[PDB]
Structure 1
């Protein structure tokens, strides 16, 4: 329909944005190459796009976006030498070649943890604002190779606006570190949301993403009609599909478009959008993404009416399954803005399973008329876990809770690799902080949605190199029952203990020197390995091993010759610990 896709997107996005997405795209496809390779790729591509803008007939201007990006990545001399089997993608035709690159996205790339000097940072910034802006896109995007790319350009500006307001202060440090931290959460979170949106389509079909889009949209805009929501849903699903499939130019473009549409139709969508719609382009879509719920309209009928009472349920459903089910989702979501999206989807799935068996039965209506009680039962099911988990969080504090979750997970999925068990248990206990201080009514929803983000990370880390059958099962059985499914696991008897490996339990003076985070991780790693070796260790003993350990580090980090003390106290500690675990 357009002579030249690259021309079209360049015009549409404008140079600056066009360059920032190309970079992000290269940086996600190729997470090792240094910055500088990438800025070369970015400009080559952009020069060429400029030629196509001026003359659309010009050779190459007709190629697809994959073919052009892909053409550019094959010309990397580093490929075979840096990326291994990656350079074999270059031997294929499109679209297999593109598929092949995308399958080498690495969810755990192992990159220097970003230690920033407020000084060096305000330097680099005053020297080159635009290169700074790019550098940040690169570093985030290479570490989060599914990160929502237009939402990333948004963060890059906010980053830049943080230094524009803070480098001209006197105590720059004190202005920066708060704002950086606050932003840097928001970015990890955004990444994990985005990774779960891609994990939907990839493992469960565009229909799962589409359904997410209904739940989210209906909650946010419950005034809007099904017909309208249905429109926004088609557009929102395409943005995310394109986005997850690495088509960032299309992603950005259709997203800007959808914001423009939403604004031009506030009267049929929401009363909360005034403030959003007066913002510039990137900020507009974010504000929208964050806008407040609209008020549930007034005389809505019972849901029982359309979905349980009505004798024609099986008729409407057989006629168009996903559409009818989208309607259930709109109707349920628009009335329960408090609920977790995971929950709404969990309800929709169950209502599906229900019609699925009931419409094949002799009087469907007797079977399905009773379904809402079953749904009431599901929403109430998880409430006691919360309580247990919050009390435990309050008693132990965040860090102790991370430890309890380390033990807990290591017993249920001890075949999981240790890096993954530590990362995930650390995130799981950050849920305590996120959700436990909230008013009770709010807790279950909060938790349900965070645990989905986090359990997805486990599934995604594990599916890379799969080792535990239970995890594979929970990860592939569903998205929306993962939390129940993980919560229903228990330690197992099949597991042979890991042979003692002393190397994993030695400590050196370095331990005193590490940044705090890295110090926690090193101990939580030991803790995991301990449970893999001693999977029956009881909680009182582990309390002993844990006090004894803190006494040990404390003694040794206080000593005149710390090495000597570690050398000596070290083996003492292995010995008691080996002794205490019978």
Structure 2
């Protein structure tokens, strides 16, 4: 319009407008309390109404970044709570937002929420809109890049669970499974978008486009490349907007994209009917997770247009990015079975083949044989999966994570321990989420998740950079990250950490911790073990681990548990030291 804030309020409605802003403030200022953020939301919302009534009013012409940003700077506690973030205020837009974004904490160390059915069901009956708002808040301050519109959708879902389950006889039995299920979908989502924002920030839009072209051509093989391109442009803008903190424009731009998809479903896909009858937030989610359409019946083989054809360099030279998109599009729509990362490497390889072969005397002789060279890039992944799935089948989740701890602590011992523990834990879960699946689906499953988790490792590592190898693997290429990490081996350069008793002492507090935090503490100890005794043998750790559990199980049952750990602890230390020589 004439007034960006006005347009947003009109298109989105007050409800979603307030949600999205609550989120914005929650992701930028992750340590502020909910009550204060609600005040800020209402203020901005009142201003928004003024501008809708009167697009000419003072300030209404300013971008959301300017307006929202002018609000952060008016926060009295800003420097007290966030230090150098206050300095962002001394700057102009766009640098001011670039600055604010750069202080978003990807690991806030906020307390793990332990949901209590009573208190939650009380809060819900008491005030449903506020309940919803606090959920938006608690997730947004922990996931500062969470896809804002999807977060609205989850908040709705969350609420629907409470509406249903607080009526029931056993509140807890009804809802606890339901929020544990949803909570896993949310954590995945978080990661999925964090990889989107990391891509654009570290490798440019171009990298995100390529991802999308792959993803959508798989989903919509029936669509002409013209359409997929419009879809990708629109979907990329949506993400760029969310990633830069313009949540209202992200929300609006996404709803527009869903309307367009439903209006043209005849030239996009036959599997959208049920999606396109749903309410606004639910409609977009449904599209994003839609079933892949069938592949057109008689398609020409790839070799025809990308290897046997005699004008390939000519066409490539004259539209490099379109031609590579085209390839990706055509290859992608033929292979829904493939992982999006594999598809992208094939594109990256194919690209490298063209760049090299097109400078030679006889380009065709060179590029003719390219799909034999790509066949290899599909087989390489299939080895790891099989081996790692066997290792998973053998050990089960927990034991499997402990192998990964060992492998990765040897690979990258400089990395912080909490990072190693979190990442190895998530890497292990991949066994549960994938190996159980139909043998053929295994690699695509694991390749996608690994992509998500390895991204988390890079983002955590990028802040306190301490390992040249992680840095090399994280920054060299987005597509080859998984292979880069796989290929790392332990480094004999690494001087082992000096012994530190405090790392191996366990306190009676341990028996109070829930299973997950129990394993964390043990898995923390394991990491520290390999940092200090990095050449320690698989067989030796069996007994050391065996003896930690024998020790832990030995004291949590004892008459005076405090008295137990006092004497028995030092036993472990002395024992383990001797064992590891």
TM-score category of the 2 structures, normalised to the smaller one: over 0.9
Aligned mates of 2:253, 2:381 — CA distance in 1: 38
Report the Cα offset of residue 301 of structure 1. 0.4
Q: CA deviation at 1:354?
A: 0.9
Residue 390 of structure 1 aligns with which residue?
Answer: 389
Residue 381 of structure 1: CA displacement?
1.1
Q: Describe the superposition over 1:196-227 as per-residue Cα deviations: whole angstroms up to 9, x where unpaired.
A: 11111111110000111100100000001011
Q: What's the CA shift for 1:141?
A: 0.6
Tell me the residue number matched to 1:40: 39
For structure 1, the 5+ residue unaligned runs are none
Shift in Å, 1:98: 1.1
Cα distance in structure 2, aligned partners of 1:106 and 1:558: 40
TM-score by length of 1: 0.99
> Offset at 1:312?
0.9
Moved more, 381-390 or 13-22: 381-390
Specify the SS of the correspondent of 2:472.
helix
Aligned to 2:467: 468
Output the CA distance in 2 between the equivalents of 1:436 and 1:6: 48
Partners of 2:559 and 2:426 in 1: CA distance: 36
Cα distance in 1, alignment partners of residues 34 and 100 from structure 2: 19
Matched, 1:199 2:198: yes
CA deviation vs aligned residue, 1:243-281 (integer Å, no higher than 9, x gap): 111111110001000000000011111110100001000
- Whole-angstrom CA distance in 2 between matches of 1:470 and 1:334: 35
Cα separation, 1, equivalents of 2:220 and 2:566: 64
1:171-186 matches, cutoff 5 A? 171-186=170-185
The structural deviation recorded for 1:516 is 1.3
| 1:93 positional shift | 1.0
Q: Residue deviations 1:344-378, cap 9 Å, x none?
A: 10111111111111111111111111110010111
CA distance in 1, matches of 2:469, 2:358: 33
Q: Deviations over 1:101-142 (max 9, x none)?
A: 011111111101011110000000000100010000011011
Secondary structure of 1:109's counterpart equals coil
Matches of 1:146 and 1:473, distance apart in 2: 24
Q: Report the count of equivalent residues.
A: 581
Distance between the aligned counterparts of 1:143 and 1:319, measured in 2?
A: 46
Using structure 2 for the length normalisation, give the TM-score: 0.99
1:137-158 deviation line (CA, Å, top 9, x unaligned)? 0110110011101010000000
Cα-to-partner distance string for 1:296-347 (whole Å, 9 max, x where unaligned): 0011001001111111111111111111111001100000011110111011
Q: Distance in 2 between matches of 1:465 and 1:396?
A: 33
Deviation at 1:51, TM superposition (A): 0.2
SS in 2 for 1:57: coil
| Alignment-derived partner of residue 578 in structure 2 | 579
Take 1:387 and 1:211, find their aligned partners in 2: how far apart are those partners?
A: 28
| CA displacement 1:394-438 (0-9 Å, x = unmatched) | 111100001000011000000000000000000000000011101
2:260 corresponding residue in structure 1:
261
Matched, 1:170 2:141: no
Partner-residue secondary structure (3-state), 1:322: helix
Distance 1:197 1:102 in 2: 15
Report the Cα offset of residue 162 of structure 1: 0.6
Post-superposition CA distance 1:147-177 (Å, at most 9, x none):
1010100000000001111101111101111
Output the aligned Cα RMSD.
Answer: 0.6
* SS of equivalent residue, structure 1 residue 382: helix
- Distance in structure 1 (CA, Å) of the matches to 2:2 and 2:222: 40
CA drift at 1:515 = 1.4
* Separation in structure 1 between the aligned mates of residue 180 and residue 420 of structure 2, nearest angstrom: 24
Counterpart Cα distance in 1 of 2:143 and 2:507: 33
Match of 2:534 in 1: 535
SS in structure 1 at match of 2:132: helix
Three-state SS of the structure 1 residue aligned to 2:496 is: coil
Post-superposition shift, 1:542? 0.2
- Could you tell me which residue of structure 2 aligns to residue 434 of structure 1? 433
CA distance in 1 between counterparts of 2:529 and 2:335 reads: 44
